[PDB]
């Protein structure tokens, strides 16, 4: 799930750079969604969970901004 979480967000970032909000959104929601599921299942501590949460919360905001841009 870790690789899928990173590989997903990684593809979303590149997409956003190539004027691909659509492909970037699907990859973003897929990455963040997989990240959260990984935390609820397994985690290290509040510290680590925080770093993963902040990165997810920020990624989620960008998603809604993309879907809204085209919508």
């Amino acid at each position: 799930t870790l690789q899928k979480a990173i590989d997903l967000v990684t593809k979303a970032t590149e997409e956003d750079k190539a004027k691909n909000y659509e492909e970037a959104l699907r990859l973003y929601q897929h990455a963040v969604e997989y990240f959260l599921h990984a935390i609820k299942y397994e985690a290290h501590s509040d510290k680590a969970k925080e770093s993963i949460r902040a990165k997810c919360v920020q990624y989620l905001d960008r998603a809604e901004k993309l879907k809204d841009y085209l919508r």
Partner: peptide, 13 residues
């Protein structure tokens, strides 16, 4: 976590 977790679930669905 529930904040973004909820808004995220709505995005996909």
């Amino acid at each position: 976590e529930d904040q973004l977790s909820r808004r995220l679930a709505a995005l996909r669905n």
